[PDB]
């Protein structure tokens with residue numbers, strides 16, 4: 001089977017999306033994952049957006065795994081440089097019907113009290129105890145402590161283009177990050193066996209989070225906007 | 238044992254380069270792999286450019302393999318759309334002291350008579366009997382019949398940015414192609430075991446070719462210019 005969707009922009013009450021927590025669509029078409037009031041990003045915010053319908057990444061009958069490609073544009077504006085912006089956004093794949101997890105450094109996808117598996121590509125802006133210098137792109141498998149990491153310089157408020165591609169034959173998950181205004185290109189890849197970590201049917205989407213209250217810093221925040229998003233998956237068997 | 242060089246521009250008679258066949262550096266600093274006379278690309282042309290010093294991709298004593306990253310910008314101008322431009326350019330790695338191979342669809346790196354091993358990333362503009370729709374990026378190992386392929390749309394005469402990265406721990410060779418003027422991004426990756434195909438010391442460089450006379454089409458041509466090039470390899474030990 002081949003499934004695919006495209007979003008050139010977003011409208012209020014998009015029937016193909018599942019918004020959770022602080023996630024919402026602005027009047028001028030952008031998907032704001034985290035809370036922003038009067039043009040100002042708030043702390044203690046967590047939001048997710050999932051594609052309404054589940055997609056099948058693999059079939060147990062034939063044992064075949066799907067190959068997929070996803071592209072999206074996001075923007076992170078960091079109004080308060082000091083002490084430190086937080087926390088970042090991620091593109092992720094998880095079992096269907098999950099609830100928003102812990103916020104802060106966990107981006108809203110990890111729940112210590114009852115963990116569910118997931119594969120995620122993160123754009124980390126805050127340095128937790130388990131993180132290397134930030135910002136950085138990271139490939140996460142069942143944990144927020146990345147298997148592979150690469151540093152990148154953020155184009156504050158600028159637009160970022162991301163291409164995530166997964167080839168089932170080689171099991172290579174490669175992501176590309178581009179800031180057209182700066183002409184900078186960042187690349188990272190790692191081997192991930194989807195069949196080994198996720199169930200046959202999953203949900204795909206984004207999740208982000210701002211500074212957690214425990215950090216005692218209202219300045220630890222930023223925006224996490226998704227401007228556009230296309231997804232395509234192919235399962236031969 | 239880290240090695241790296243950077244050519245932000247090309248000078249007449251570069252002491253660090255080895256030009257072969259039709260390859261030459263224009264007065265305005267660009268590296269023209271194939272022949273172009275009076276601003277017009279000729280057919281029956283083949284040229285290569287190798288970094289003068291050999292680089293060590295792996296060490297037999299420790300068994301360790303090098304990781305490397307290379308970035309470059311090229312431009313392909315296609316003056317004659319009909320009947321078909323040809324043939325393309327490639328970035329490649331081969332044993333030191335090799336001679337230009339067959340031209341045409343072989344880009345000047347393959348020699349049926351006496352083949353030598355090589356790993357190359359191709360940007361193919363002509364569709365040979367062994368090729369899929371063109372243009373396409375392709376990863377070649379010891380042969381011009383690609384292991385992995387991805388189609389791309391050329392920005393005629395525009396500038397292209399390429400990022401080729403090889404991670405020895407995962408053996409993943411991933412390349413990224415970007416046409417800044419169109420904002421388009423193309424990505425491809427595959428697993429290649431350098432230690433298994435190439436000798437300890439190799440040469441890195443470019444090779445390109447225009448329409449072969451046997452095709453009986455003088456229009457089967459285009460330019461193959463390299464604007465800038467940086468390389469870097471880290472061999473632990």
Ligand SMILES: *[C@@H]1O[C@H](CO)[C@@H](O[C@@H]2O[C@H](CO)[C@@H](O)[C@H](O)[C@H]2NC(C)=O)[C@H](O[C@@H]2O[C@@H](C)[C@@H](O)[C@@H](O)[C@@H]2O)[C@H]1NC(C)=O
Pocket residue numbers: 079080081082083217219
């Ligand atoms: C949180 O962000 C605020 C806005 O960026 C910081 O205040 C700004 O601090 C600038 C330099 O310290 C100063 O030039 C600006 O006028 C001021 N902006 C306003 C109107 O708040 C804030 O910095 C703290 O608060 C200011 C008022 C001073 O007390 C500074 O010494 C403080 O660092 C940031 N707070 C934190 C926790 O960093």
Ligand SMILES: *[C@@H]1O[C@H](CO)[C@@H](O[C@@H]2O[C@H](CO)[C@@H](O)[C@H](O)[C@H]2NC(C)=O)[C@H](O[C@@H]2O[C@@H](C)[C@@H](O)[C@@H](O)[C@@H]2O)[C@H]1NC(C)=O
Pocket residue numbers: 044213
């Ligand atoms: C961070 O956001 C939380 C919700 O997104 C806040 O808790 C919410 O507080 C509301 C009170 O105004 C209450 O109706 C909601 O049920 C509750 N949500 C849940 C289930 O936690 C949380 O802090 C709360 O609100 C402040 C004003 C105090 O009333 C606290 O005691 C609450 O826990 C926010 N964290 C902070 C430190 O502001």
Ligand SMILES: *[C@@H]1O[C@H](CO)[C@@H](O[C@@H]2O[C@H](CO)[C@@H](O)[C@H](O)[C@H]2NC(C)=O)[C@H](O[C@@H]2O[C@@H](C)[C@@H](O)[C@@H](O)[C@@H]2O)[C@H]1NC(C)=O
Pocket residue numbers: 281450
């Ligand atoms: C394609 O380019 C070739 C050069 O790499 C031409 O081959 C000829 O090679 C000879 C020895 O290697 C050399 O003396 C010639 O100068 C050169 N071509 C000439 C005459 O300039 C080849 O030219 C054709 O083939 C040669 C053997 C001669 O018969 C020429 O008259 C032919 O044009 C070029 N092919 C074509 C079809 O243009």
Ligand SMILES: *[C@@H]1O[C@H](CO)[C@@H](O[C@@H]2O[C@H](CO)[C@@H](O)[C@H](O)[C@H]2NC(C)=O)[C@H](O[C@@H]2O[C@@H](C)[C@@H](O)[C@@H](O)[C@@H]2O)[C@H]1NC(C)=O
Pocket residue numbers: 316317318319320456
């Ligand atoms: C080889 O490239 C040439 C330049 O692009 C083509 O000639 C051009 O063809 C145009 C129509 O395709 C015509 O309007 C132009 O006047 C002409 N310009 C030149 C430089 O001659 C050429 O096209 C064929 O050959 C020429 C000589 C004409 O007879 C055209 O009508 C033919 O289509 C290209 N050759 C091929 C195989 O198309």
Ligand SMILES: CC(=O)N[C@@H]1[C@@H](O)[C@@H](O)[C@@H](CO)O[C@@H]1O
Pocket residue numbers: 086087103104105106126128210211212213214215216217220
């Ligand atoms: C574990 C955890 O969520 N840690 C958070 C961190 O991610 C960030 O939100 C910070 C902001 O000041 O507050 C805490 O340290």
Ligand SMILES: CC(=O)N[C@@H]1[C@@H](O)[C@@H](O)[C@@H](CO)O[C@@H]1O
Pocket residue numbers: 323324340341342343363365447448449450451452453454457
């Ligand atoms: C095998 C070979 O070199 N084939 C070439 C092809 O690569 C291209 O140059 C074409 C142009 O007319 O002429 C021939 O078919």
Ligand SMILES: [Ca+2]
Pocket residue numbers: 087105124125126127128131
């Ligand atoms: Ca973090």
Ligand SMILES: [Ca+2]
Pocket residue numbers: 324342361362363364365368
């Ligand atoms: Ca070809």
Ligand SMILES: [Mn+2]
Pocket residue numbers: 122124131132136138144146
């Ligand atoms: Mn991280």
Ligand SMILES: [Mn+2]
Pocket residue numbers: 359361367368369375381383
């Ligand atoms: Mn090819």
